[PDB]
Amino acid sequence: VSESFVAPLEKRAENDVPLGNDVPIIDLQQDHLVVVQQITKACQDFGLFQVINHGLPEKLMAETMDVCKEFFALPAEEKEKLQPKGEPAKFELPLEQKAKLYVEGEEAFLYWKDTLAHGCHPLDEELVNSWPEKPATYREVVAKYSVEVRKLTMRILDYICEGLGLKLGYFDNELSQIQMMLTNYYPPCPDPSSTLGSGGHYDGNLITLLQQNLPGLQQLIAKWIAVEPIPTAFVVNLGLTLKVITNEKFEGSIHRVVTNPTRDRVSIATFIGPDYSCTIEPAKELLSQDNPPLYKPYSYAEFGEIYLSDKSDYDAGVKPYKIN
Numbered sequence: 001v002s003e004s005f006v007a008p009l010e011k012r013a014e015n016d017v018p019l020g021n022d023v024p025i026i027d028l029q030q031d032h033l034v035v036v037q038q039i040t041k042a043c044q045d046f047g048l049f050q051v052i053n054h055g056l057p058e059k060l061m062a063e064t065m066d067v068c069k070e071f072f073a074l075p076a077e078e079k080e081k082l083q084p085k086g087e088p089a090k091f092e093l094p095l096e097q098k099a100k101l102y103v104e105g106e107e108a109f110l111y112w113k114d115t116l117a118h119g120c121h122p123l124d125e126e127l128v129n130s131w132p133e134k135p136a137t138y139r140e141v142v143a144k145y146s147v148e149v150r151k152l153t154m155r156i157l158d159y160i161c162e163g164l165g166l167k168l169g170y171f172d173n174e175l176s177q178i179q180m181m182l183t184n185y186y187p188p189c190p191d192p193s194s195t196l197g198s199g200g201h202y203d204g205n206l207i208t209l210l211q212q213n214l215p216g217l218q219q220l221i222a223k224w225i226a227v228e229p230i231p232t233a234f235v236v237n238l239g240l241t242l243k244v245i246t247n248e249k250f251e252g253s254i255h256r257v258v259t260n261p262t263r264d265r266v267s268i269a270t271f272i273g274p275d276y277s278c279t280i281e282p283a284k285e286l287l288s289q290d291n292p293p294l295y296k297p298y299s300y301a302e303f304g305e306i307y308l309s310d311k312s313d314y315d316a317g318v319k320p321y322k323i324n
């Protein structure tokens with residue numbers, strides 16, 4: 001491959017990463033308290049779990065994956081319409097909510113990935129008119145998907161509230177006001193041993209719901225494991241923001257994506273989290289002399305600038321705000 005895509009030796013994935021047999025798969029149609037308890041345990045112990053029987057229509061999940069795949073099948077002349085000044089946009093602030101194609105990377109290198117990203121909340125004519133024009137059904141399908149994924153995310157955040165002992169709706173405010181949808185395209189890679197689809201990271205936001213049909217997602221436990229694709233499930237990744245607000249009672253998910261030499265892969269990730277104007281701190285309701293705050297309050301915008309630029313460590317974004 002082009003030297004642009006060659007990862008530093010220490011970041012390259014080993015060829016045989018084992019299945020994560022201990023990744024929790026949580027049935028949301030169990031009894032209410034069982035769901036609260038299983039989500040709580042997964043959040044405390046792993047920070048990454050899957051949800052099934054989650055109430056989001058399977059048909060809609062399939063239609064959304066279809067229109068996302070159709071988008072990435074569009075010819076170059078249509079994709080150029082989402083490349084500002086003739087090249088993909090960068091993940092840097094300000095992160096605008098209009099649809100763009102993005103490039104991402106970090107011994108500088110690029111991730112083997114094309115990403116379409118746009119905001120989803122609140123839905124209005126102005127936002128949806130800034131979404132892709134093609135395929136014709138993208139706007140109708142993804143509007144419905146974005147509303148359903150938000151509804152499911154807020155259900156999971158309220159299960160989390162009950163598990164933590166926070167009032168229901170604790171996160172139904174400025175802490176969840178940004179909803180970015182990223183559709184990721186990983187074309188076949190001639191040298192998977194040298195490249196990464198996505199470098200190891202925490203999601204910087206509050207919570208992310210990821211939809212996948214094919215292997216490539218891996219989680220850091222020391223050891224990397226493979227997250228089994230369940231096409232009708234969502235993968236839930238807890239973000240650095242939730243790790244801070246819970247005072248590290250919950251784990252954040254550290255995960256990466258590897259390339260494939262023979263087939264393409266499309267994933268859909270919905271990133272819910274604070275507005276850039278938000279102040280992030282450990283929830284005061286949970287703090288005590290036995291549970292002192294491990295972070296000072298900080299600007300989400302200030303965090304975001306570091307998080308998007310500094311990949312010296314997974315939690316480089318929050319290192320400046322660590323206390324006690």
Ligand SMILES: CN1[C@@H]2CC[C@H]1C[C@@H](OC(=O)[C@H](CO)c1ccccc1)C2
Nearest residue numbers: 091180198201203204205271273304307
């Ligand atoms: C693989 N990369 C990682 C995660 C997704 C993707 C793009 C970038 O993350 C985001 O753009 C999200 C959007 O909410 C974000 C932006 C600023 C602060 C917190 C979170 C970095």
Ligand SMILES: [O]
Nearest residue numbers: 202203208269
């Ligand atoms: O991500």
Ligand SMILES: [Sr+2]
Nearest residue numbers: 054055056057
């Ligand atoms: Sr339903």
Ligand SMILES: [Sr+2]
Nearest residue numbers: 128129130131
């Ligand atoms: Sr437009």
Ligand SMILES: [V+3]
Nearest residue numbers: 202203237255
């Ligand atoms: V991620």
